[PDB]
Amino acid sequence: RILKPWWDVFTDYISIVMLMIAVFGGTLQVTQDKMICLPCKWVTGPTGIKYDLDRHQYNYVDAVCYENRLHWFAKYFPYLVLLHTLIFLACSNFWFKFPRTSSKLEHFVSILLKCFDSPWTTRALSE
Amino acid sequence: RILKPWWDVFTDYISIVMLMIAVFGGTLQVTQDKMICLPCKWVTGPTGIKYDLDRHQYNYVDAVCYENRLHWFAKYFPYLVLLHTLIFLACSNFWFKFPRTSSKLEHFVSILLKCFDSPWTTRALSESETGVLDKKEGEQAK
Amino acid sequence: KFDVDCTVDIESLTGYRTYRCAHPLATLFKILASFYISLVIFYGLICMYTLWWMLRRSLKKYSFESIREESSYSDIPDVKNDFAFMLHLIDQYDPLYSKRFAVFLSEVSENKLRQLNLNNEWTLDKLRQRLTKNAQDKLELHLFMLSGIPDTVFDLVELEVLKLELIPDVTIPPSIAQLTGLKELWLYHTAAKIEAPALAFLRENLRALHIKFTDIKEIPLWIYSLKTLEELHLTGNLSAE
Amino acid sequence: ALFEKVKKFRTHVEEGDIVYRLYMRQTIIKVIKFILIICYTVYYVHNIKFDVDCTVDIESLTGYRTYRCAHPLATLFKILASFYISLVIFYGLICMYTLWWMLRRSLKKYSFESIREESSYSDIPDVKNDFAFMLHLIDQYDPL
């Protein structure tokens, strides 16, 4: 249990901070993301130029252009991070919790803590 | 209880990822799903077309097309995933918590853990030889 | 589909037949749906591997042959069996724990255990209160059906005549020569065939032997090499020529 | 009896091959996964843009072709994207340190000789050698 080296400790902290960024971008990406589009048309001074659109036409071109002409990486960035950092945590945790080698480790740290506790080897080590 | 093979371990962790997808799709499907509809009509250069419609009617035709002409599988995908992965959890969980053969396993692991535990089997496994033990581990091994 | 085409009965209320309808979420459901079935085919594929072991290498007594071939490998040969398929799952866990179970299961081993239970559960006050009899200090496991000789027997040198009817001890411990007072030995209803260098110990110790009610096979052959025996008791040799 | 258990350990381990091969395969796929993702993610950072243009098939439903499209969130994804890969490159450097430790000095027998040289120091000299690689991890904890 405390057989983990130090670098796997920093692997653990990097892992949880990493997915903390992932769940932040995922939450923010779901509840707040949208796109704002409007047409380029040409391709007493200042007045308001006006279009002829309705509200959901504007919302439609938001959806269509948002799906089509935007990069999937910019869309699914927190999901790639979240899935991908589960690969890293699954690697280190997988090695520790593969079954038969976990029997090796559990067996070994069992007898090893007995070896730590043996007061005769404390005494015979002291002489 | 710690007798499960490796593939049942993979069954557990793939199972909990699977229900995590289910609760993600269900939550997202409740609070963010809608449909955007507007009519096809035909079937200083560019100006915006206009419809004599209303925000009212857009929400109405949203509900009509969303209920009618949309596939039920896309409507109920997380619920099929959620209920269906609880079929898998009920398979392994129910097989292990079947009553009478679960009593067989519980009794079995009790004598199994003691059978790991007995230092006389460390001794008798470890070897005209002698050696005198104490009393009560004899009683335990009896 | 991302982009569906709707056509409904609304025309008297809104006055249009066909509605181009975009669903802004189908790409997300599509990608995690494909990710979902990818997870399931990996899942059920491993379930098929379990079935392939179920039909390939799994039986009702296959692990029992692992017990007894392991026991012939483990020098405690004759071991009985209890159900293998649950034992097969722990065979997949580790054969080390399988080894712990079978080594506990063998009757030679627990025979040795209850023999040691005899060895610490006959006490000095017991045979102390069984010492002095008819002519001399005479002890009885005679008519007592004990499975083994206690080791506090060779503690108390006061013994002179030993009585050993009804006992399955084929062997006697070599430390029995500590009993230098013992010279008259009753070995009836038993088959003590010691196979130890204690015979030379009693080659120069004893003078009386009692082999009562003993059949044709159960005459311990190596024992009668002690050339200081003086009297012999051979009742029950129901023997032809 | 604990010496018998250590004697059992001395028997059944047989110099611990599966935990070495398992540990080696899992750390090597961790490293090559790291190199793969830093390739395409640095290839896609500049493809995050604040303001993009749009030219689609919407003429029959709106009458227009081109749309100025401001994404109001790309600066936030940009800063935590660059912050993110800064965290990842620090992580993958640690993965390189573990792999170089694996290749540099740790073997099946190196802590076997640490037992023997350390026993020459501890002056109970002739000691055998149970399995080093798991013991290397404890050598990474302390020689105590």
Q: Rounded to a whole number, what is the distance in angstroms from the first to the last CA of chain B? A: 26
How far apart, in Å, are the Cα atoms of D5 and each of A114, B137, C188? 11, 18, 43
Q: Which residues of C125-148 are buried (b: 16+ CB within 10 A; e: fewer)?
A: eebeebeeeeeebbbbbbeeebeb
D chain contacts of residue A19, beta-carbon cutoff 8 Å? none
Which residue of C lies nearest to B70 if distances are taken between CA atoms?
C4
- Residues C142 and C163 sit within 8 Å (Cβ to Cβ): yes
Residue B141 CB burial class (10 angstroms; 0-12, 13-18, ≥19): buried
Q: Dihedrals φ, ψ of C90, to 5°?
A: -80, -20
Across the interface, which of A53, A59, A98 has its CB nearest the CB of B36?
Answer: A59
- Residues C141 and C165 sit within 8 Å (Cβ to Cβ): yes
CA dist., res. C218 & res. C235, Å (int): 13
Phi-psi map region of A92: left, alpha, beta (phi>0 left; psi -120 to 50 alpha): alpha
Q: What is the DSSP letter of B77?
A: H
Q: Which residues of A68-99 are buried (b: 16+ CB within 10 A; e: fewer)?
A: ebbeebbbbbbbbbbebbeebbebbeebeebb
> What was the elucidation method?
cryo-EM
**DSSP secondary structure letters along C122-134:** S-HHHHHTT-B-S
CA dist., res. C14 & res. B59, Å (int): 12
State whether the Cα torsion B118-B123-B124-B130 is positive or negative: negative
Q: Count Cα atoms within 13 angstroms, Cβ side, for D48.
A: 21
How much of chain A is helix, strand and coil, in % rounded to 5? Answer: 75, 5, 25
Resolution (A): 4.2
Cβ contact B42–D60 (<8 Å): yes
C63 C-beta neighbours (distance < 10 Å), count: 24
C30 C-beta neighbours (distance < 10 Å), count: 14
- Residues B47 and D63 sit within 8 Å (Cβ to Cβ): yes
Nearest to A7 by CA among B103, D90, D107: D90
The DSSP bridge pattern shows strands C184-186 and C208-210 to be parallel
Q: Which amino acid is at B18?
A: M
Residue C105 CB burial class (10 angstroms; 0-12, 13-18, ≥19): middle
How far apart, in Å, are the Cα atoms of D141 and each of A2, A7, A8, A106, D137? 9, 12, 12, 17, 6
Query: Cβ of B5 under 8 Å from any chain D Cβ?
Result: no
**DSSP secondary structure letters along B8-73:** HHHHHHHHHHHHHHHHHHHHHHHHT---EEEEE-----S-----S--HHHHHHHHHHHHHSSS-HH
- Residues D62 and B49 sit within 8 Å (Cβ to Cβ): yes
C chain contacts of residue A64, beta-carbon cutoff 8 Å? 3, 22
Q: Mutate one of B38, B41, B44 to test the A interface: name it (highest A CB count within 10 A).
A: B38
Cβ contact B25–C22 (<8 Å): no
Cβ contact A56–B50 (<8 Å): no
CA dist., res. B83 & res. A87, Å (int): 26
Number of DSSP helices (H) and strands (E) in chain C, helices first: 7, 7
